[PDB]
Design a protein around this ligand. Structure first.
Ligand code: NAP
Ligand code: FIS
Length: 316
């Protein structure tokens, strides 16, 4: 297991990154500091997580301390839905850069295919509670993302939560200048994404697996949802390998040639989650873990099911 995967922009991406959604602003600076100390070289961020300033404090301290060089870090952020207008994309990117206190991003993603009315609210609502869409389509947002590359603000651009027909729309875009480098999508043994992953990989798009542990801290969790970390069948595979269940859940996407971004603010778990370069799941183990799919989603963006570009009506 090589630690980096080559992207279609010619850059190499660390296959293990630290996630930061739900990382409290008072804890994420230490979490990122610890992660860099123990080997992480990829951080997944987003403006909508509201903690990029604090992530950036950690990155800047470790660069100043010469723990790491900027070229060795792979920092990812995402354009929120209320900034899909061509006129707003550069400013959104520059706010993220200023907060992370970076002069470029390694990868900038369209966070969802759905554009929303611009304004202060991240989910603008009409008086009946529906998200108010914007009329800007993904192809024009993609052209705006391409401009960021040509201005030196980002080294790579990509997409997130795009279904196969939306990926296809970008790939067939008239005048397409840069293909997406990455599609970041939810992926774990209960949502194995075999069709979308094969589609993307056949097109040279690298897939990043989010919520690889099933996001036990998601705010809408219910007692009765399936729990990957407690699943006896996955615990048994971990036991056989003398690893934790989380380590198996992280190694699993790695062996599918995916990038994976487990979140933790717990220093011991940050370190444990990185220790996944000392063991191999068998092909039998991989097939068995794939057999647990149930099309169960952590992130279904339920407030936006009537948006024209809602991604999860389509089978994949
Ligand atoms: N593109 C998108 O739309 C999108 C959507 C969702 C997620 N993401 C990205 O993907 C990242 C990861 O997904 P996620 O945050 O939803 O969930 P996750 O990484 O599947 O799970 C995070 C949860 O697992 C816990 N945990 C971490 N390591 C553990 C271990 N070794 N043992 C037991 N529990 C462990 C964490 O607890 P502690 O933190 O308390 O340790 C936290 O409660 C995000 O943070 C974000 O960066 C992107
Ligand atoms: N959807 C979201 O991104 C936030 C996440 C979160 N906000 C946050 O900082 N950690 C969280 O889990 C949150 C917490 C809640 F209690 C209720 C909604 C909610 O939604």
């Amino acid at each position: 297991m090589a630690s980096r995967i080559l992207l279609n922009n010619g850059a190499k991406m660390p296959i293990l990154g630290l996630g930061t959604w739900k990382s409290p602003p008072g804890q994420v600076t230490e979490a990122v500091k610890v992660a860099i100390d123990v080997g992480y070289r990829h951080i997944d961020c987003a403006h909508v997580y509201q903690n990029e300033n604090e992530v950036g404090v950690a990155i800047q301290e470790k660069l100043r301390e010469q723990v790491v060089k900027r070229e060795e870090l792979f920092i990812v952020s995402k354009l929120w839905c209320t900034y899909h207008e061509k006129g707003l994309v550069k400013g959104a990117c520059q706010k993220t850069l200023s907060d992370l206190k970076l002069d470029y991003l390694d990868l900038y993603l369209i966070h969802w295919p759905t554009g929303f009315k611009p304004g202060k609210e991240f989910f603008p609502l009409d008086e009946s509670g529906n998200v108010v869409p914007s009329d800007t389509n993904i192809l024009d947002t993609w052209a705006a993302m391409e401009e960021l590359v040509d201005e030196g603000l980002v080294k790579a651009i990509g997409i997130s939560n795009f279904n196969h027909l939306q990926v296809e729309m970008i790939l067939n875009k008239p005048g397409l200048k840069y293909k997406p480098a990455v599609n970041q999508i939810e992926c774990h043994p209960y949502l194995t994404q075999e069709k979308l992953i094969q589609y993307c990989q056949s097109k040279g798009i690298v897939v990043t697996a989010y919520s690889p542990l099933g996001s036990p801290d998601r705010p809408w969790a219910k007692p009765e949802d399936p729990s990957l970390l407690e699943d006896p069948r996955i615990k048994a595979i971990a036991a056989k390998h003398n690893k934790t269940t989380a380590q198996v859940l992280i190694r699993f996407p790695m062996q599918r040639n995916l990038v994976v971004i487990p979140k933790s603010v717990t220093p011991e778990r940050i370190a444990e989650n990185f220790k996944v370069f000392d063991f191999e799941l068998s092909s039998q183990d991989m097939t068995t873990l794939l057999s647990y799919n149930r099309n169960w989603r952590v992130c279904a963006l339920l407030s936006c099911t009537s948006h024209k570009d809602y991604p999860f009506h389509e089978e994949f």
